[PDB]
Amino acid sequence: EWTGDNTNAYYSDEVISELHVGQIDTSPYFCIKTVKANGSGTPVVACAVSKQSIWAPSFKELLDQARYFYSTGQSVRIHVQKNIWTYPLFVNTFSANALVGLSSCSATQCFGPK
Amino acid sequence: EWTGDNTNAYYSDEVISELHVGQIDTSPYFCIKTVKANGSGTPVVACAVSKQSIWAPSFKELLDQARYFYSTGQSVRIHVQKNIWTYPLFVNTFSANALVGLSSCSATQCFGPK
Amino acid sequence: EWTGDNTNAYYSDEVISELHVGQIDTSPYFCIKTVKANGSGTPVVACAVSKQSIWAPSFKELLDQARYFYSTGQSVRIHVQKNIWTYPLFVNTFSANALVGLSSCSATQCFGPK
Amino acid sequence: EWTGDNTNAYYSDEVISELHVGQIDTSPYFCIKTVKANGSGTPVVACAVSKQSIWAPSFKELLDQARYFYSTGQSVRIHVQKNIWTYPLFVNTFSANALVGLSSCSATQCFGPK
Amino acid sequence: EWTGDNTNAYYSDEVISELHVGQIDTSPYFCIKTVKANGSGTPVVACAVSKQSIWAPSFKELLDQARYFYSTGQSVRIHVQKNIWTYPLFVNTFSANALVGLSSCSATQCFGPK
Numbered sequence: 001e002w003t004g005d006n007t008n009a010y011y012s013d014e015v016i017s018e019l020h021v022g023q024i025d026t027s028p029y030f031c032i033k034t035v036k037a038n039g040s041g042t043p044v045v046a047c048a049v050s051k052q053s054i055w056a057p058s059f060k061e062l063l064d065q066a067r068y069f070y071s072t073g074q075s076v077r078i079h080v081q082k083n084i085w086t087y088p089l090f091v092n093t094f095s096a097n098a099l100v101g102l103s104s105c106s107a108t109q110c111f112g113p114k
Numbered sequence: 115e116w117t118g119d120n121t122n123a124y125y126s127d128e129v130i131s132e133l134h135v136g137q138i139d140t141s142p143y144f145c146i147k148t149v150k151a152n153g154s155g156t157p158v159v160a161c162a163v164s165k166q167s168i169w170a171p172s173f174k175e176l177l178d179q180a181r182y183f184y185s186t187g188q189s190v191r192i193h194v195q196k197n198i199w200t201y202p203l204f205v206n207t208f209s210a211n212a213l214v215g216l217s218s219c220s221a222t223q224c225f226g227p228k
Numbered sequence: 229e230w231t232g233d234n235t236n237a238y239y240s241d242e243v244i245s246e247l248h249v250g251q252i253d254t255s256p257y258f259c260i261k262t263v264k265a266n267g268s269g270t271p272v273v274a275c276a277v278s279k280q281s282i283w284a285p286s287f288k289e290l291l292d293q294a295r296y297f298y299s300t301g302q303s304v305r306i307h308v309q310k311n312i313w314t315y316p317l318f319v320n321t322f323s324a325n326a327l328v329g330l331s332s333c334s335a336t337q338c339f340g341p342k
Numbered sequence: 343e344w345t346g347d348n349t350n351a352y353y354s355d356e357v358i359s360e361l362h363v364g365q366i367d368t369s370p371y372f373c374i375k376t377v378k379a380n381g382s383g384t385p386v387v388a389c390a391v392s393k394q395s396i397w398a399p400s401f402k403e404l405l406d407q408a409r410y411f412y413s414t415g416q417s418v419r420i421h422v423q424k425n426i427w428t429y430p431l432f433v434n435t436f437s438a439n440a441l442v443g444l445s446s447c448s449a450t451q452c453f454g455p456k
Numbered sequence: 457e458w459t460g461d462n463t464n465a466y467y468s469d470e471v472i473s474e475l476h477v478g479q480i481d482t483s484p485y486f487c488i489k490t491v492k493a494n495g496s497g498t499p500v501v502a503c504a505v506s507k508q509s510i511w512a513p514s515f516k517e518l519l520d521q522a523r524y525f526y527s528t529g530q531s532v533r534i535h536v537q538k539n540i541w542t543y544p545l546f547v548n549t550f551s552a553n554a555l556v557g558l559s560s561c562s563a564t565q566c567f568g569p570k
């Protein structure tokens with residue numbers, strides 16, 4: 001598996017606008033909300049859950065990087081895999097998207113799988 | 115268990131106003147005090163104890179997130195579970211509330227369960 | 229044991245004015261020097277030593293917390309246990325106090341045991 | 343092996359201009375893009391993969407250092423080992439360069455092997 | 457062993473002016489360069505290697521503290537042990553000094569062994 005698999009989805013020119021940390025079924029987790037930097041479109045919500053899903057190994061790296069990009073407010077590309085979380089109240093509050101990568105979008109293009 | 119269980123309690127539009135770190139019964143712990151962003155009402159005190167309670171797995175994530183939100187002073191929703199800690203002098207000093215989640219808040223909503 | 233045990237000592241409204249990191253007898257350690265925000269009294273010195281004393285579990289907290297309060301210069305309550313370190317040259321340079329807790333302060337109180 | 347081996351390659355006076363975090367084959371990874379501080383030449387891309395290559399042990403140290411230099415915009419020397427990564431879609435997105443060191447640069451000389 | 461042993465060497469009123477991270481013989485390492493705050497004298501270079509020397513246990517604490525004092529530019533006392541590293545190309549690039557301690561310095565004194 002790879003962040004850049006064509007079976008994943010991504011959204012460019014986004015800003016991380018909200019951050020939540022909690023625990024579910026023995027696992028610390030976090031969720032982020034992102035919105036287009038220019039104010040268009042619909043928010044993207046994605047979560048990472050420790051020790052859950054194939055993306056578990058990168059939980060700490062993604063939490064650290066989400067915090068970093070949240071603090072700068074810079075434009076980013078957010079990479080997700082859809083339909084991963086199944087806990088129904090959790091999905092309704094947040095989403096079923098697993099967070100699988102984060103890329104800066106400084107220069108003339110976003111720096112990540114395209 | 116989940117941060118968002120309705121048997122937990124939460125308080126919206128708060129700011130983390132105080133932070134304490136210590137040790138009890140061989141466990142590092144920390145506590146936070148929050149107040150309404152507008153200054154009204156009564157403070158909320160909540161603690162996390164590293165190897166105690168069902169929320170022990172999230173100790174480091176919550177410590178790191180509390181420190182971040184304390185440093186920015188931004189508005190948050192604090193999620194707690196009541197009546198968890200029972201060390202008598204500890205409860206007098208702080209509270210019996212376990213910290214179980216932290217959500218960033220905009221002017222109109224908070225990014226977390228309600 | 230507890231940070232708040234009445235057999236420990238504490239000093240309120242102090243500023244962490246100096247910070248030192250080293251190693252002794254296989255253990256990383258750090259020490260801090262604190263002074264009253266108003267300049268009265270005499271400075272307090274306390275150290276935490278990795279894998280040494282009953283307070284060893286909280287070494288990495290405390291170190292991270294001391295660094296933060298050192299960086300802001302804010303007024304804190306420092307909690308110590310006296311007469312813990314016995315290495316004579318070390319005590320002469322620093323002190324025998326073990327650092328056991330750190331609490332932020334407001335204009336009227338500090339957020340910690342007293 | 344050593345960062346400074348003459349079988350590695352290095353580029354002086356570069357600014358870290360992009361950062362990406364993801365996962366591949368159960369391993370967190372990150373990539374950076376750097377450009378000459380004066381704008382000349384072509385960008386350097388290098389990645390570190392936490393579970394892969396002889397450089398795996400330094401993954402966290404390099405990620406933390408890359409994040410710091412990215413945040414300051416200071417000029418650095420980037421040390422790489424060429425032709426390490428082999429997944430074609432990964433190499434085409436990023437590069438085959440393994441990141442093996444990062445050095446600050448004085449106004450006249452970079453602080454690392456050359 | 458102790459940072460403050462008189463068989464170690466120290467240098468007061470220095471500023472950490474350069475920072476390098478790399479890997480050697482499966483071990484992450486870092487090096488710093490320091491110069492007198494007042495611009496006089498000869499620079500001091502010292503390194504820490506995660507898996508090597510009697511000072512290995514303090515690698516992470518010294519890395520974090522070196523990064524902190526590097527970021528603030530404040531004046532420090534650097535404590536080293538001479539003639540530790542032996543790989544000739546490494547020593548020629550950097551030095552044989554092992555980093556064994558870092559102390560903050562006021563105008564009058566430094567908070568560390570002397």
Ligand SMILES: CC(=O)N[C@@H]1[C@@H](O)[C@H](O[C@@H]2O[C@H](CO[C@]3(C(=O)O)C[C@H](O)[C@@H](NC(C)=O)[C@H]([C@H](O)[C@H](O)CO)O3)[C@H](O)[C@H](O)[C@H]2O)[C@@H](CO)O[C@H]1O
Pocket residue numbers: 009010011012013041042
């Ligand atoms: C690829 C596609 O579905 N539609 C094409 C447009 O995307 C494209 O117009 C450009 O769109 C750019 C944004 O492209 C992405 C992105 O954010 O990187 C590509 C993503 O694959 C896509 N993600 C998903 C799940 O579909 C994503 C998403 O649709 C939006 O982000 C949601 O708001 O868009 C960018 O905005 C360019 O400025 C814009 O020109 C063109 C190709 O040139 O044709 C469309 O069919």
Ligand SMILES: CC(=O)N[C@@H]1[C@@H](O)[C@H](O[C@@H]2O[C@H](CO[C@]3(C(=O)O)C[C@H](O)[C@@H](NC(C)=O)[C@H]([C@H](O)[C@H](O)CO)O3)[C@H](O)[C@H](O)[C@H]2O)[C@@H](CO)O[C@H]1O
Pocket residue numbers: 351352353354355383456
């Ligand atoms: C064919 C050839 O060998 N050409 C070289 C010169 O073009 C070049 O000129 C000097 O370059 C200096 C910078 O030196 C490095 C550096 O960045 O530190 C040395 C690196 O080994 C090299 N990296 C490689 C080959 O992978 C790197 C790179 O080649 C470019 O210079 C940077 O994009 O340059 C410095 O800028 C001087 O001002 C300049 O005169 C040097 C560099 O090797 O010597 C010739 O070999």
Ligand SMILES: CC(=O)N[C@@H]1[C@@H](O)[C@H](O[C@@H]2O[C@H](CO[C@]3(C(=O)O)C[C@H](O)[C@@H](NC(C)=O)[C@H]([C@H](O)[C@H](O)CO)O3)[C@H](O)[C@H](O)[C@H]2O)[C@@H](CO)O[C@H]1O
Pocket residue numbers: 465466467468469497498
């Ligand atoms: C040739 C010689 O050794 N001269 C000595 C003087 O440098 C010195 O004068 C005072 O030095 C003060 C700084 O003292 C230290 C320091 O940095 O804390 C003491 C250290 O032990 C020494 N470290 C060594 C030798 O490894 C260190 C070092 O020499 C300098 O930092 C290098 O620049 O100096 C301070 O600068 C005073 O302003 C000055 O009066 C004294 C004591 O060393 O007499 C001579 O021995």
